Amino acid sequence: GSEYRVDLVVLSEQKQNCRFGLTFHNLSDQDLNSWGLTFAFDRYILPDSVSNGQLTQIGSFCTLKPEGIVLAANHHYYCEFSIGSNPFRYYSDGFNEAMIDFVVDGQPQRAQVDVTPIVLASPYRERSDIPASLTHAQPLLPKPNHIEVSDHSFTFDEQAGVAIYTDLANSAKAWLLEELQRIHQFTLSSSNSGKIIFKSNPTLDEGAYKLKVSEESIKIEAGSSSGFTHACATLLQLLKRDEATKTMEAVCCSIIDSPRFRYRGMMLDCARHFHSVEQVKRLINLLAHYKLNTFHWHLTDDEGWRVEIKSLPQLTEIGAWRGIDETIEPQYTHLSQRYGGFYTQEEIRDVIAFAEQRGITIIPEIDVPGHCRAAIKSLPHLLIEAEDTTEYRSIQHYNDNVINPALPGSYEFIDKVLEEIAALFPAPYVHIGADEVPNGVWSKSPACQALMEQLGYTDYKELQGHFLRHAEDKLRKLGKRMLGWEEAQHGNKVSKDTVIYSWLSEEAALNCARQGFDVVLQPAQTTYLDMTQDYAPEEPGVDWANPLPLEKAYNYEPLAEVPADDPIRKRIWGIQTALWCEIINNPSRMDYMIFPRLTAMAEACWTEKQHRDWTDYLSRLKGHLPLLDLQGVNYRKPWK
Ligand SMILES: CC1=N[C@@H]2[C@@H](O)[C@H](O)[C@@H](CO)O[C@@H]2S1
């Protein structure tokens, strides 16, 4: 391939102390003058471990520059270094991207470096195996909580017609027709005497529906828009197309259906890598296919700010872009280009309208006071304290990325973001983040030192709560309830109205629910679509929780140990599944990580525990698979 190649090797592993060898090959014919290697690595390289040369790390962005000044043609450079971390189980744990800057007979140059797959020392031997499976006659995902199926069937064609006798169901019906068209080039038209009938039924509670196929008709009953949307999403899975006759076929059957959990979410990280309006919409559409109702928009982080804030235009003019010649350095991938994007308010209004039509509420996340590098680099005049010499390092290996809660500019900033955010997103909810604020922060900040004294705080976590409580008070004045990751509770300053997302595990969900907090369960051990799907080292993904095979994700039972009687269970809003995109930058990888485990997650959100069975779910998945092939969704194939 390239004339420049880097080989990385696990030399040795002693508990939490891994030594690597790095060999850089100048394969070409030229001597390389004053050169330097830059790559993307998500582990923190111990700076005093480096064997040979100068190495710099800013998050994932590393540069290696040799002690010497020339790399001879056909030779190479060698460097060793160590990290604290458990053994690498995956090729993904290696460098994601490498590139070289150099000079040749006097001329600056830049070239892509081939990155050889890391030579692993301790791959896994175990493999998750999925058994051979039948195709299920009704490949429905999530499994309806009641369904009776008859021996016969109702066949119908493009003149069958669609009847609607309540305006609650107008959105569902137009979503149904749209999807029949997009997925199947099957055009239904609306007629007063259609064989598909949307009628109202007020005994059915929110999101419940009834669907009955008979020899004459197909009837959809619900008391809510969302129940009509859910019914339509079952019907799209139920129908079976004959292209030779251009007919649809649905088994005669009776379905009565309702969700186990009110909160059935999916979060998408769009800060680490930007995804297009069309990709985001395409996802939201696929979310309503499985009857989820919440799209949690992670729009802000250290490596990107993706939501336009008219009153703070720097946040996108600067924070939406990173790379060598930008204010923000390259991160994770696209080392050689200017990389980014962002959503305008008009785009966002469009995505909201699109998702409303699908029964999906969108919750924006403005992540503070950690994970703020992009905001801080965009707005240094409001968010930097020049006099702070606290030396800290975050989980992602930044030391300059945390909001200062004693700076009046930090309140200027958040008051302005939240006002526009609140105005923009109709949902009565704003997620404030609050994850992974490093332990050392603010300890040497004069301004924080003075505010710590001024109101008698004894812990610097108390300063974080002070800020989040201000965010909550502003959100409340704007009509929004605040949501937060579990660490928002740190400092015990935020009110019992803050909805706690439990992600490290289910522990905070349990603890916080006992104390009167409403919680959402997003445990990393069972709900993170960025985790690898198998133990084979070729599986893309990360693994800090644990590998998450399909069967693990399916068999997740939320708070499996709180008895169903327990009034703790009244504080569970529901479940969320998340995709963080550190190593995800293209729709093909996205689809692979999300599907199919998302459908196992939608079934935990929706179906009652007593109707959930692994073997049964695999046969419904096997019969759904073709429907994702028709949509060109690049799911990881259970059976390959
Ligand atoms: C809350 C969370 N903040 C971290 C995120 O910034 C990372 O992307 C994710 C990767 O799994 O780990 C947790 S979850």
Same domain, 232 and 326: no
What distance in Å separates the CA atoms of residue 90 and residue 532, rounded to the nearest whole number? 9
Smallest Cα–Cα separation from 140: which of 558, 607, 575, 595?
607
Query: Which atom of ligand 1 approaches the CA of 436 most closely?
Result: 3
Query: Which atom of ligand 1 approaches the CA of 433 most closely?
Result: 1
Same domain, 316 and 447: yes
- Give the alpha-carbon dihedral of 348, 352, 353, 354, to 10 degrees: 100
What distance in Å separates the CA atoms of residue 91 and residue 592, rounded to the nearest whole number? 16
**Cα(528) to centroid of ligand 1, in Å?**
9
Element (H, E) at 178: helix 170-184
Q: Which of 226, 259, 292 is the last residue of a domain?
A: 259
Please indicate if the annotation marks 269 as binding a ligand: no
Q: Compute CA 68 distance to the chain's CA centroid, rounded to the nearest angstrom.
A: 43
Instruction: For residue 18, give the 3-state DSSP assignment.
Output: strand
Please indicate if the annotation marks 573 as binding a ligand: no
Query: Which atom of ligand 1 approaches the CA of 485 most closely?
Result: 1
Q: Which of 195, 229, 259 is the last residue of a domain?
A: 259
* Measured CA distances, 507 to 314, 354, 557 (Å): 39, 35, 14
Same domain, 354 and 434: yes
Q: Where does ligand 1 bind, in terms of residues with CB under 6 Å? A: 435-436, 485, 503, 528, 530, 542, 580, 582
Please indicate if the annotation marks 31 as binding a ligand: no
Q: Specify the number of domains making up the chain.
A: 3
Which amino acid, residue 310?
Answer: K
Query: Which atom of ligand 1 approaches the CA of 371 most closely?
Result: 6
Token pair listed for 17: 């102390």
Protein residue closest via CA to atom 7 of ligand 1: 580
In sequence order, the 6+-apart residues with CB closer than 8 A to the CB of 527 are 521, 553, 556, 575, 576, 577, 578, 601
Protein residue closest via CA to atom 11 of ligand 1: 580
In sequence order, the 6+-apart residues with CB closer than 8 A to the CB of 152 are 215, 251, 252
Long-range contacts of 313-319 (CB under 8 A, 24+ apart): 314/378, 314/379, 315/374, 315/375, 315/378, 315/379, 315/417, 316/342, 316/378, 317/378, 318/374, 318/377, 318/378, 319/374, 319/375, 319/377, 319/378
Same domain, 553 and 520: yes
Q: Which of 128, 160, 183 is the last residue of a domain?
A: 128
Same domain, 220 and 331: no
What distance in Å separates the CA atoms of residue 502 and residue 522, rounded to the nearest whole number? 5
Smallest Cα–Cα separation from 345: which of 312, 304, 308?
308
Protein residue closest via CA to atom 1 of ligand 1: 435
**Cα(601) to centroid of ligand 1, in Å?**
18
Same domain, 439 and 542: yes
What distance in Å separates the CA atoms of residue 38 and residue 511, rounded to the nearest whole number? 44
Token pair listed for 196: 């598909």
Token pair listed for 90: 């995956």
Residue labelled with tokens 């969900």: 509
**Cα(580) to centroid of ligand 1, in Å?**
7
Please indicate if the annotation marks 420 as binding a ligand: no
What distance in Å separates the CA atoms of residue 305 and residue 75, rounded to the nearest whole number? 42
What distance in Å separates the CA atoms of residue 544 and residue 539, rounded to the nearest whole number? 14
Number of H helices, E strands in the chain: 16, 28
Q: Which experimental method was this entry solved with?
A: X-ray
Which amino acid, residue 143?
Answer: K
CB 82 within 8 A of CB 20: yes
Name the catalytic one among 80, 436, 462, 551. Answer: 436
Same domain, 124 and 142: no
Task: Give a three-class secondary structure readout of 453-503.
Answer: HHCCCCCCHHHHHHHHHHHHHHHHHCCCEEEEEHHHHCCCCCCCCCEEEEC
Q: Compute CA 16 distance to the chain's CA centroid, rounded to the nearest angstrom.
A: 28
Protein residue closest via CA to atom 8 of ligand 1: 580
* Measured CA distances, 385 to 41, 85, 185, 376, 455 (Å): 29, 32, 59, 11, 20
Q: Is 192 exposed, middle or buried (0-12, 13-18, 19+ CB in 10 A)?
A: exposed
* Measured CA distances, 195 to 188, 206, 216, 401, 612 (Å): 11, 25, 7, 59, 32
Same domain, 248 and 302: no
**Cα(460) to centroid of ligand 1, in Å?**
22
Same domain, 394 and 429: yes
Same domain, 139 and 270: no
Q: Residue 221, Cβ neighbours under 10 Å: how many?
A: 23
* CB crowding 516-533: b at 16 or more within 10 Å, else e: ebbbbbbbbbbbbbbbbb
Smallest Cα–Cα separation from 302: which of 398, 415, 390?
398
In sequence order, the 6+-apart residues with CB closer than 8 A to the CB of 376 are 383, 384, 400, 401, 402, 403
Protein residue closest via CA to atom 5 of ligand 1: 580
Query: Which atom of ligand 1 approaches the CA of 269 most closely?
Result: 8
Protein residue closest via CA to atom 10 of ligand 1: 580
Mutate to test the pocket of ligand 1, among 436, 501, 577 (most ligand atoms within 8 A of CB): 436
Same domain, 124 and 147: no
What distance in Å separates the CA atoms of residue 307 and residue 363, rounded to the nearest whole number? 13
**Cα(503) to centroid of ligand 1, in Å?**
8
CB 615 within 8 A of CB 551: no
Query: Which atom of ligand 1 approaches the CA of 544 most closely?
Result: 11
In sequence order, the 6+-apart residues with CB closer than 8 A to the CB of 9 are 20, 21, 22, 23, 118, 119
When computed from its CA atoms, the radius of gyration of the chain, rounded to whole angstroms, is 27
Specify whether 329 is catalytic: no
Protein residue closest via CA to atom 3 of ligand 1: 435
Q: Are strands 17-26 and 4-14 parallel, antiparallel or unpaired?
A: antiparallel
**Cα(73) to centroid of ligand 1, in Å?**
42
Half-sphere exposure of 317 (CA within 13 A, CB side): 7
Expressed as residue numbers, the domain containing 80 is 1-128
Same domain, 201 and 255: yes
DSSP β-bridge partners for residue 7: 23
Q: Are strands 519-521 and 572-579 parallel, antiparallel or unpaired?
A: parallel
Half-sphere exposure of 438 (CA within 13 A, CB side): 21
**Cα(341) to centroid of ligand 1, in Å?**
21
DSSP notation for 63-104: EEE-SSSEE-TT-EEEEEEEE-SSPP--GGGS-S-EEEEEEE
Size (the chain), residues:
640
Smallest Cα–Cα separation from 274: which of 327, 229, 334, 231?
334
